Amino acid sequence: GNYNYLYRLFRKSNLKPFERDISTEIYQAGSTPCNGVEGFNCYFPLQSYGFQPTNGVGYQPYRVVVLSFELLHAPATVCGPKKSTNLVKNKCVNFNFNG
């Protein structure tokens, strides 16, 4: 079991989109608080995933990443690889240089 990946099982309020929360606060079920000692109501949210080679293909840990694209006041972004061609000479040819 690959017990190296954890996750936030519970949270008092829904997370704001694109926010990373790094806190040790424990979930509060009722009104009785916990002073750091685990009990019947502390409910430590953190839990570790268990990944084994025998896990089914549909439940394997998929390595997923997210790429964001938004426009802000900052101009002159960076795009993908612009495609360049081979130049020619002594011919009436349309040319599209950088700008």
Partner: protein
Amino acid sequence: STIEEQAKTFLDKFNHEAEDLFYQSSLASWNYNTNITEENVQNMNNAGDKWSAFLKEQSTLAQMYPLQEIQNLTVKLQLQALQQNGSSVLSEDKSKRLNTILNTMSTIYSTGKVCNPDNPQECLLLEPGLNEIMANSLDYNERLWAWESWRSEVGKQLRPLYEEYVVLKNEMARANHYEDYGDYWRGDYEVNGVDGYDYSRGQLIEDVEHTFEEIKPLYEHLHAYVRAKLMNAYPSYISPIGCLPAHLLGDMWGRFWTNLYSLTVPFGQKPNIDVTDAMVDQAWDAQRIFKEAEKFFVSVGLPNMTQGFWENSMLTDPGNVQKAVCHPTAWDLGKGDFRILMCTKVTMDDFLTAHHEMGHIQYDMAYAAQPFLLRNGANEGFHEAVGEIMSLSAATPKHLKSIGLLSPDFQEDNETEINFLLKQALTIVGTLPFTYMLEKWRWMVFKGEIPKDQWMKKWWEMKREIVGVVEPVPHDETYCDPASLFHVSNDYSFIRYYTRTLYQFQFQEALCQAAKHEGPLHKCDISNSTEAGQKLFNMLRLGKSEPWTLALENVVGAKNMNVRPLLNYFEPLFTWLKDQNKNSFVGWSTDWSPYA
């Protein structure tokens, strides 16, 4: 600030925790079934105890939440099962007897002994010793000794031990605020909280009895017919006016009548329908037998098996030193992991066994999306019945010709069908009285309204009346042969098999009508019909999330336990038996002649 939300807040955390511990327990148990060593036994005990204790603490944490105001039906079922205190009522001293007594029973029951007293030549375990000495030999004198070799050498010492087991287990009903321990097994079929669909716990006994008066006439003709043919092997030893011996119905307990097919063949001069020689001609192997099963399911419409099964499971027996048991069992490890445990062999039963067993795995993944507590069938009978419906279709001559195992030109005559129908009747109709035979005794003994001295006299007398079996030799009270059975000795609800036959036939007609089949039920097929596939998948995915009573309405539309659509399947076989039994003595009264 409501009870409904509090229950959900508790179940969700338990679901994540329960599956994590279950997965570790499930994967660990597989190693014990592959390589057994002295250090392996202790390792499994370490993991088992914590897993067993995990549910104990969770049950206490759910006690203070009242169940009288949670309108959500999904959590009511989950909370009811998780709140079973069980053995917590027993004191520390009393709690230690359960493990010790059960453990010594298992090892004692695992000691197979057929060595002749005063003649210790040799004797092996149950499977190599007991099965061969009765399925091949035809000697009455040694068969009688084999009957006493197990009921007088193993069951004799269980009289004082079985006595203490029943008297304390019956007390658990009071500790759980129940009527009797037998009533506990009836809670699965109990339905409550729905207006008009409620099923009373005591209705199960009456319904089972109410469905028995139609089984008896079929059994009366079957018993009359089988005794006539069994008389041939023993011409002058048994009179054809009484009942039949107990030790001539396939198994020692008579559960399966498969072995009687050869002895009572109608016309054995012509070759039987066997394709064993055909398989070796084409060089069939382990991979080819299972792959043909996979393409059978896709034709119906169900999704094919995942890729984490073929390369992750074992098919044949590995090595030579590995003697780990390979009993047919269904494994649902979760997270898309599914395995099959069995020792593959080139035989008719094993080929059917693989098809029969793999059906359970398919049903397991149907309700995977449900929580761990609800990750099960509607009731104990649904799981076994679902895995046998496809077996009937797989054995049809039409399906055999579809793949190509059978010859392209094979006539389907009356003789070619009676033998096939008779084979199913032996393993279906024959075992039906026996399944109700054992449960009725267990229900009354757990109730406690049976004095000690009347156990043996009542057991034999009513056996001769309903079942119709003569005792090979008189037995006194100290004998405890009914407890030697596997399910009863290990505290397993054997009633689930009684509903298996009824459930299988109820769905068989439901699936056949959904398949738009035009012909007799015995010739019905389910393959190449997406309408049947979607109908089945609709109910399988329900699992335990919905009441089992509503599941019946989704296939046949009847809320009650229907009994009519089970004899129609056997109507053909009944017709040819009626005229053949015109002169045979059908209907047996009390008989003392064989052992007067």
